[PDB]
Write a protein that binds this DNA or RNA. Structure first.
Ligand code: MG
Ligand code: MG
Ligand code: MG
Ligand code: MG
Ligand code: MG
Ligand code: MG
Ligand code: MG
Ligand code: MG
Ligand code: MG
Ligand code: MG
Ligand code: MG
Ligand code: MG
Ligand code: MG
Ligand code: ZN
Lengths: 49, 126, 182, 116, 79
RNA sequence: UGUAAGUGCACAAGGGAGCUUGACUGCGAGACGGACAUGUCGAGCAGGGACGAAAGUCGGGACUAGUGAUCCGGCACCUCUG
């Protein structure tokens, strides 16, 4: 498939909100980006599941 | 009967300065209620002017060439600070508060930095 | 509280020698050295990139300033070269480093080359600049003969303010480059 | 030990340790050890730095080894191949120059065997 | 024998949309052009899709500036 | 100037370098053409951010193709019901 669909989840509240695509071949390791979580109210690290 | 062969450092410098000044001007503008502060830097002095782009006329200006500034014993950085507070006072007398900077292409630092801090201290909002 | 001897020579005797010999208009039409460039063309980077490190080390030892690597702007198939690879290193100095390097060269390197017959005066380009190449690098004392793995040549270029060939030739000949006689 | 960029054997007699240098051989090693006065049966564990330094100085003063020898041999090769000499032509063709029985011998020079 | 041609796309209805002397209401679209066939002037912004529009009410007034085809909006006086 | 053409870009949208994920959330005054629903842009407000001293820019990619209604069902959460 080359481009699977992945979902990003918050670390404290555990809600899956954002979804994006990536290259598993290019980046075998997992992603870690900072987005905005609505209930938490502040930027928090996000780790894909 | 001597013909120079290569372009001169003076013109490399002048052309680069003009090009980068135009680069910044592409985004930086001015208006009547917010006159633009321009600075022209030299190896021996410093110049500052206030210009309204709508009419192409200046409101006030000052430079270190003046005798009172020249009389200061301190460094030419101190001269820059002196002219900075002088232009701050002149602009306040004119009746303008909000202004923007036209660095003129010269990289920020040193004299420009000191002038900016002196202005900010004098009580101009920007 | 120091000054290179070559710089001394130049500013004391060479300047007025050339001035009186060529009858210049003012005291600053006399040409002066500008810069000097050192580089090599290997072409074996495509097959192995280890020798590049060795070249960098030799340049660092001989000059004392870490060189810079250069990439290729044109990918070519029949030479099996593509964009992005480094092939050679370039070094340029200024000022007292030129003075010291030229002193060391003129005083040590030139007399030491096996079968040294001089330098061809017709190596100029017509604008008053000099550049020539070497086939070996072990002549220099700073490099120990035991630690070299392969023989590597080099190319040397010097650029001055001479308007044309004549002024630069006179200046450098007064400096004392061992040319031929033709 | 080490000498002139050559790693001497971990455990071997000096008469062979010096032999392993390109410019020194069996009888040459015998001659240098006789001149220096160092006995020839000792192993590589009994050497001293000062003896190595003096030996290096003597050999570099009275002989050329390794890189110098290789480059001068190659200089001879290129000059003989350029002058158009018979030895130059033999080098071009890849054969011993003395004119041995190349009909059957010279296999060592010509290298492996290829069948037509 | 046959032909491999005969296919075509649709049309995007591109082109100028408002002319000079027009009373333009705030936020109106002025020109829909593909490239940068025109450059923004005073009180004129350019969108993501190379679209030129107006920011304040006024009258359309074209012009040129140093070898450019420019778009300008004049603030007609309030009656 | 990733991917065809055109329109453009020598002031850069070409290349090089430092930092960082706005490829956000809640909104939208008005227009674009369309028989129908699909399609396009947008100033400006609030929260909390990024870059930059400041002025200031950021709701993915110089622009126009990389896609698919209805019904049924799965998964996480919810101050709905029962
Ligand atoms: Mg990567
Ligand atoms: Mg020249
Ligand atoms: Mg087809
Ligand atoms: Mg069409
Ligand atoms: Mg876009
Ligand atoms: Mg760029
Ligand atoms: Mg997306
Ligand atoms: Mg509407
Ligand atoms: Mg905000
Ligand atoms: Mg916006
Ligand atoms: Mg974009
Ligand atoms: Mg881009
Ligand atoms: Mg159905
Ligand atoms: Zn959360």
């Amino acid at each position: 498939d080359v481009r699977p669909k992945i979902t990003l989840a918050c670390e404290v509240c555990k809600h899956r909100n954002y979804i994006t695509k990536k290259n598993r071949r290019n980046d075998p390791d997992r992603l870690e980006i900072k987005k905005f979580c609505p209930n938490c109210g502040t930027h928090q690290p996000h780790k894909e599941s | 009967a001597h013909k120079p062969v290569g372009q001169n450092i003076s013109e490399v410098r002048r052309n680069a300065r003009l090009r980068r000044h135009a680069r910044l001007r592409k985004k930086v503008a001015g208006t009547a209620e917010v006159p633009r502060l321009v600075v022209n830097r030299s190896a021996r002095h410093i110049h500052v002017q206030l210009v309204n782009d709508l009419n192409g006329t200046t409101l006030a200006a000052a430079s270190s060439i003046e005798a009172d500034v020249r009389a200061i014993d301190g460094d030419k950085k101190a001269h820059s600070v002196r002219v900075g507070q002088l232009i701050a006072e002149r602009a306040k007398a004119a009746g303008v508060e909000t202004v923007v900077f036209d660095r003129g292409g010269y990289t920020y630092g040193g004299r420009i930095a000191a002038l900016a801090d002196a202005a900010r201290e004098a009580g101009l909002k920007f | 509280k120091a000054l290179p001897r070559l710089k001394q020579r130049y500013r004391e005797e060479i300047r007025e020698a050339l001035q009186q010999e060529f009858n210049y208009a003012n005291v600053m039409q006399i040409p002066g050295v500008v810069k000097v460039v050192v580089n090599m063309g290997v072409g074996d980077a495509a097959r192995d990139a280890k020798l590049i490190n060795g070249a960098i080390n030799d340049l660092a030892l001989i000059t004392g300033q870490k060189p810079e690597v250069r990439r290729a702007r044109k990918s070519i198939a029949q030479f099996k070269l593509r964009e992005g690879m480094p092939i050679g290193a370039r070094v340029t100095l200024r000022g007292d480093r030129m003075w010291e390097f030229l002193d060391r060269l003129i005083s040590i390197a030139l007399p030491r080359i096996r079968d040294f017959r001089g330098l061809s005066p017709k190596q100029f380009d017509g604008t008053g600049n000099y550049t020539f190449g070497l086939n070996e690098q072990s002549m220099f004392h700073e490099i120990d003969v035991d630690s070299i793995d392969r023989p590597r040549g080099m190319d040397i270029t010097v650029v001055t303010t001479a308007t044309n060939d004549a002024e630069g030739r006179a200046l450098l000949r007064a400096l004392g480059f061992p040319f031929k006689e033709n | 030990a080490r000498l002139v960029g050559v790693d001497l054997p971990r455990d071997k007699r000096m008469e062979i340790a010096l032999t392993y240098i390109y410019g020194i051989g069996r009888t040459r090693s015998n001659e240098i050890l006789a001149a220096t006065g160092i006995d020839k049966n000792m192993r590589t564990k009994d050497l001293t730095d000062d003896q190595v330094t003096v030996l290096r100085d003597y050999i570099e003063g009275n002989l050329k080894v390794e890189g110098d020898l290789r480059r001068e041999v190659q200089a001879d090769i290129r000059r003989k191949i350029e002058i158009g000499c018979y030895q130059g032509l033999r080098h071009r063709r890849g054969l011993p120059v003395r004119g041995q029985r190349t009909k059957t011998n010279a296999r060592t020079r010509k290298g492996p065997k290829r069948t037509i | 024998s046959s032909s491999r041609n005969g296919r075509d796309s649709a049309a995007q209805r591109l082109g100028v949309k408002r002319f000079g002397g027009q009373v333009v209401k705030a936020g109106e679209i002025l020109v829909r052009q593909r490239g940068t066939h025109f450059h923004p002037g005073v009180n004129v912004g350019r969108g993501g899709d190379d679209t030129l529009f107006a920011l304040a009410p006024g009258a359309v007034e074209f012009g040129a500036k140093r070898g450019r085809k420019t778009v300008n909006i004049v603030p007609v006086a309030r009656p």
